[PDB]
């Protein structure tokens, strides 16, 4: 098809306008004081939301050049949220800030490449500054505070996550579920999570999460060298009449006929998923039986002579809920007797101190953490079905952010961290003036989140920013209470990974737009 082709400022103005539409709609929702955005549906009542992610999903523009701008920022901002578990709105605000000033500098005739170079140097520096400024998240009070902030000021979610980690540890495995109702519930059941992905896509159920999920699955374990689908048929008939889904764990899955396992489940007849066994040699086999003892079943080894059609249903292990993934498999509520589990845990212990090299000492210590660790299950309570499912969503978001906070620590929220990092960079320079201006563009933009938060409050951004800047450290503005104080003392905490990622991704896409001379799209 023939193309519409724009260059230079003509192209760049278009991009900026589309970015301005996306950002202006997303950014009004920033903060505890964020405004509502009404999102139409083709039927019934409109959706009213303060959630920036929801607002961003909906944005598509008629003008194809403007729309290219909006989509570029959208993709980048969502990458951030996927990496750190939060910060979509903050990233979008940043992108708009850098993009606006950067383009201003381009139009003034400054070197675009130099502007991009300077923005990058500021960001590289800003990221280091954040690492230094960062502080560990350890005590459960701080952890609760992080969750609460990610749950949009809901002290219950943060209280739930902190309670979960208080059971299975901050590094422990945690899964969220729908409860019977009316109050949050917490139970630590038997189960484990190991790293394996599903061997082929299309296995995904509930595609929004992009992870496969089953309910009360049968579990199969083998060496997997085997042959292929044709031989293993006999076990497939028994399950079909249960009926129960099957999760096959094996050294790998090679077979094409084995790859015809994925297809027929697409037809909906029987729901199944296959996943590899982690590691090689005696290490993976010991872990195969590790899973067998947990799920109350025996592994099938073509070495020992055991054949897959020789394996009865009761012989195959079983669990309650299982969630596999691209990088991960998780077993919830394994039906294996606690006598088999604890009996083996003491054995893993025995091998520890007989083992000499510290590499065997560790990995082995990893398996004992899985069997003896279990899986924390958060059952979300509420008054209603729809009022519940929302909260299950907010708990899942707060969880990843808290995980983030555990890894890289926390910083002053409310955009205080970025504002402090900017002051620390005041003396930063590049190789020439253009790069210098690029650095200043990035530093000015670091003020955007706080100002937008303040703006959504109905307060003067210049006034709060000026007052905050006149203070030091963790001194900042609490937008909920309209008070200045110590942000950490007040419980307003961003995971450092989130703040970092938001800046990096925004600077990425901004660098590209600033460096764009040409756009090509179809004819309207």
Give residues in contact with K ion (CB under 5 A). 29, 34, 50
**In this chain, which residue has its C-beta nearest to ligand ADP?**
413
Q: Is 414 annotated as a binding residue?
A: yes
Whether residue 88 is annotated as binding a ligand: the answer is yes
Closer CB to its own copies, 132 or 523, in the complex: 523
Which residues have C-beta within 8 Å of that of residue 207, sequence separation ≥ 6? none
Q: How far apart are CA 349 and CA 161, in angstroms?
A: 30
Crossing angle of helices 338-354 and 282-295, rounded to 10°: 150
Q: Considering the rule CB under 6 A, would residue 478 count as an interface residue with ligand ADP?
A: yes
Contact flag: residue 86 with Mg ion (CB under 5 A): yes
Residue 494 contacts Mg ion per CB under 5 A: no
Is 486 an interacting residue with respect to ligand ADP (CB under 6 A)? no
Least CB distance to its own copies at residue 39 (A): 5
**Residue 486 — φ and ψ, nearest 5°?**
-80, 120
Instruction: Write the DSSP assignment of 105-174 as a string of letters.
Output: HHHTT--HHHHHHHHHHHHHHHHHHHHHH-B---SHHHHHHHHHHHTTS-HHHHHHHHHHHHHH-TTSEE
Q: Look at the chain and count its residues.
A: 524
Q: Is 459 annotated as a binding-site member?
A: yes
Options 108, 208, 237, 256; binder of its own copies; rule CB under 8 A: 256
Cβ atoms of 30 and 52 closer than 8 Å = yes
Answer yes or no whether residue 88 interacts with ligand ADP by CB under 6 A. Answer: yes
Contacted by 44, from ligand ADP, its own copies, Ca ion, none: CB < 5 to 8 Å by type: its own copies
The one among 86, 101, 114, 408 contacting its own copies by CB under 8 A:
114
438 is in an annotated binding site: no
Residues 118-137 that bind Ca ion (CB under 5 A): 132
Residue 178 bridge partners (DSSP):
380
The one segment of 78-86, 233-241, 452-460, 473-481 that binds Mg ion by CB under 5 A: 78-86
- Please, what is the minimum distance in Å from the beta carbon of residue 405 to Ca ion? 21
Determine if 517 is a binding residue for its own copies (CB under 8 A). Answer: yes
What three-state secondary structure class fits 53? helix
DSSP state, residue 380: E
Alpha carbons 254 and 275: distance in angstroms, whole number:
11
Binding-site size for Ca ion (CB under 5 A) equals 1
Range list of β-strands (E), 444-506: 475-478, 483-486, 493-495
Q: Are 332 and 354 in contact (CB under 8 A)?
A: no
Q: Residue 521 interacts with its own copies (CB under 8 A)? A: yes
31 is in an annotated binding site: yes
Q: Which helix (H) or strand (E) holds 91?
A: helix 88-107
Binding to its own copies by residue 523, rule CB under 8 A? yes
Report whether 479 belongs to an annotated binding site. Answer: yes
- Segment 133 to 162, residues that bind Mg ion, using CB under 5 A: 152
d(CA 489, CA 508): 33
Verify binding: residue 314, its own copies, rule CB under 8 A: no
- Among 26-34, 128-136, 189-197, 225-233, the segment contacting ligand ADP (CB under 6 A): 26-34
Q: Which residues are annotated as a binding site?
A: 29-32, 50, 86-90, 397, 414-415, 459, 478-480, 494
**Which residues here bind Ca ion, judged by CB under 5 A?**
132
């Amino acid at each position: 098809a023939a193309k519409d082709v724009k260059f230079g400022n003509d192209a760049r103005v278009k991009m900026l306008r589309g970015v301005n539409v996306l950002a202006d709609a997303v950014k009004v929702t920033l903060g505890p004081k964020g405004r509502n955005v009404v999102l139409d549906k083709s039927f019934g009542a409109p959706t009213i939301t303060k959630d920036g992610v929801s607002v961003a999903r909906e944005i598509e523009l008629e003008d194809k050049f403007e729309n290219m701008g909006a989509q570029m920022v959208k993709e980048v901002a969502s990458k951030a949220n996927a990496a750190a578990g939060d910060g979509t709105t903050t990233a979008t605000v940043l992108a708009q800030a850098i993009i606006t000033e950067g383009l201003k500098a381009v139009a003034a005739g400054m070197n675009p490449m130099d502007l991009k170079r300077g923005i990058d140097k500021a960001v590289t520096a800003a990221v280091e500054e954040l690492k230094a400024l960062s502080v560990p998240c350890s005590d459960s009070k701080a952890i609760a505070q992080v969750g609460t902030i990610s749950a949009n000021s809901d002290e219950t979610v943060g209280k739930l996550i902190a309670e979960a980690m208080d059971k299975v540890g901050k590094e422990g495995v945690i899964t969220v579920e729908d409860g019977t109702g009316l109050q949050d519930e917490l139970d630590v059941v038997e189960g484990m999570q190991f790293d394996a992905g599903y061997l082929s896509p299309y296995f995904i159920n509930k595609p929004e999460t992009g992870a496969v999920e089953l309910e009360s699955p049968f579990i199969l374990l083998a060496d997997k060298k085997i042959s292929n689908i044709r031989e293993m048929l006999p076990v497939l008939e028994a399950v079909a009449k249960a009926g129960k889904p099957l999760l096959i764990i094996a050294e790998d899955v090679e077979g094409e006929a084995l790859a015809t396992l994925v297809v027929n489940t697409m037809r909906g007849i029987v729901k199944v998923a296959a996943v590899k066994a982690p590691g090689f040699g005696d290490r993976r086999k010991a872990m195969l039986q590790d899973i067998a003892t947990l799920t109350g079943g025996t592994v099938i080894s073509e070495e020992i002579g055991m054949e897959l059609e020789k394996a009865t249903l009761e012989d195959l292990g079983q669990a309650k809920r299982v969630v596999i993934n691209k990088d991960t498999t998780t077993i919830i509520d394994g039906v294996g007797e606690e006598a088999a589990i604890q009996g083996r845990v003491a054995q893993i212990r025995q091998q520890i101190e007989e083992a000499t090299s510290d590499y065997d000492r560790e990995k082995l210590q990893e398996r004992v953490a899985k069997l003896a660790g279990g899986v924390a299950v958060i059952k979300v309570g509420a008054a209603t079905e729809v009022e519940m499912k929302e909260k299950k969503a907010r708990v899942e978001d707060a969880l990843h952010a808290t995980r983030a906070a555990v890894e890289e620590g926390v910083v002053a929220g409310g955009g205080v961290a970025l504002i402090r990092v900017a002051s620390k960079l005041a003396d930063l320079r590049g190789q020439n003036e253009d790069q210098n201006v690029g650095i200043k563009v990035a530093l000015r933009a670091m003020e955007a989140p706080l100002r937008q938060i303040v703006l959504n409050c109905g307060e003067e951004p210049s006034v709060v920013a000026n007052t905050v800047k006149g203070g030091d450290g963790n001194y900042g503005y609490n937008a909920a209470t309209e008070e200045y104080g110590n942000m950490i003392d007040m419980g307003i905490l961003d995971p450092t990974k989130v703040t970092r990622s938001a800046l990096q991704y925004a600077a990425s896409v901004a660098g590209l737009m600033i460096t764009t001379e040409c756009m090509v799209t179809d004819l309207p």
